[PDB]
Amino acid sequence: VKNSIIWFRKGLRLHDNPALLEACKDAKHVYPVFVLDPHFLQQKVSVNRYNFLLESLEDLQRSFQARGSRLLVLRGKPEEVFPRVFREWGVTQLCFEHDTEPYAKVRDAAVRRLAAEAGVEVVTPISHTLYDTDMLVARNGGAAPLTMQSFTKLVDRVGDPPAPAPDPPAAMPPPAEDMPSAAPAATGVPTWQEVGFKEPPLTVFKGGETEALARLEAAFQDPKWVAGFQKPDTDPSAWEKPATTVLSPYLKFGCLSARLFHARLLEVYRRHPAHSQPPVSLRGQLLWREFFYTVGSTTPNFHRMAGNPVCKQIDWDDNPEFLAAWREARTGFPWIDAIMTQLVTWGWMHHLARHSVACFLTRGDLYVSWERGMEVFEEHLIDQDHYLNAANWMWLSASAFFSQYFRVYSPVVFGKKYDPEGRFIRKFLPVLKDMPAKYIYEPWTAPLEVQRKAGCVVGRDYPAPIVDHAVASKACIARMAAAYRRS
């Protein structure tokens, strides 16, 4: 008889899950499995993203229970738990979604060899990205496109992505009863207290496939807002109702299908002939994700500078006093500190909000390496994607893809064009709630009586600016200008 395991890593969903459909096909027992390393906390990982993961597992648990099955959260290492459950459960087939990250290629190649020793068939369909990223490389001639213009031309030559897979049946084959490695007390979904986190999460974005689909339908209630979506024209200061979809945490963990997102967009574009085109359209945003996944998966040492063939070797400064002030949201610029506060509290910021803080830290003001600010992003971002977190930090630091280092955002003026009152600043930095809008972006310019009347004395309640932007940016641009000549 057929006993199969559907291994969940990414793709924490039931819709558009071809690895789950194959696992349930002609199966006597199906074992939904998610492997947890309990000593992750003892390695870097905020409670916001980890609890977002735990909520997505509880969402899978309720979905399997409604279909007569159950999710199994196995503790330990995968190269270790699988050889035991193969012989215990009488496994004949193992299915999981294809992953192109550097750690996964090592991990999955080890489980395949263990599955070959136990006589277990391995089926790894592709469903995390829009296309087969290795197929796009072969169709381009053996190398990945290095520009968005060339990559957009490539996917149009290939055509539409595969349609989202059918939904799984209403009744799934249950796991076998009285199996020791499937005991409910040792396979349940733990909370954030039991994994070792002492401070609770503060994000307002709840994980799970159900919330992802509800957040999808809400974005598609106005098809005219979807058809005319232009990314550079959105508001980074919009926090009550974010100007974009905020679907990145669900696309990272796989709670939402990229092919399902793509399909619904084409249904709206079909009825709106004047819809926006890449790279500014909503479809173009999924292409940015697909473009950076294709380049990073085929480029050695992509998340670093040394050994990276696409990254420029820049003479970044090793300044831990500027990195600390930027990391702890105490640079003295309320626009920068408010965004960094949203990073630690919500774990998500608007794309242009991530532009202002990444530019200020790197080529803009502080001239600190993009690898240092990345590690801060990989800790607090609930949507942190290995490949996407890289290319954008190399984009903002002018190390790759982007080479216009003369374009420097102003930490004082940038947020002013969207939010002259400073409503975004007063929310995440409540020490400046009473500061008048005239000095809310430059509090050090307010008279001392204005600082006292507002209860925000610069140097006592709110820090002074760590740098003069005019002097810092002028030096940073020039240093970046000679590095490009030596290139």
Ligand SMILES: Cc1cc2nc3c(=O)[nH]c(=O)nc-3n(C[C@H](O)[C@H](O)[C@H](O)COP(=O)(O)OP(=O)(O)OC[C@H]3O[C@@H](n4cnc5c(N)ncnc54)[C@H](O)[C@@H]3O)c2cc1C
């Ligand atoms: C320094 C820096 C770091 C970043 N790190 C991450 C990261 O770790 N994870 C991440 O998902 N995005 C990252 N981005 C990209 C971008 O900021 C987010 O994808 C976007 O803010 C998500 O909001 P949204 O879901 O509303 O996107 P929308 O504008 O609604 O776009 C929809 C989807 O398209 C994709 N997308 C959008 N913009 C980009 C982009 N620039 N590059 C790649 N894919 C994109 C995402 O999957 C997103 O959910 C980073 C950008 C910068 C500048």
Ligand SMILES: [Cl-]
């Ligand atoms: Cl500006």
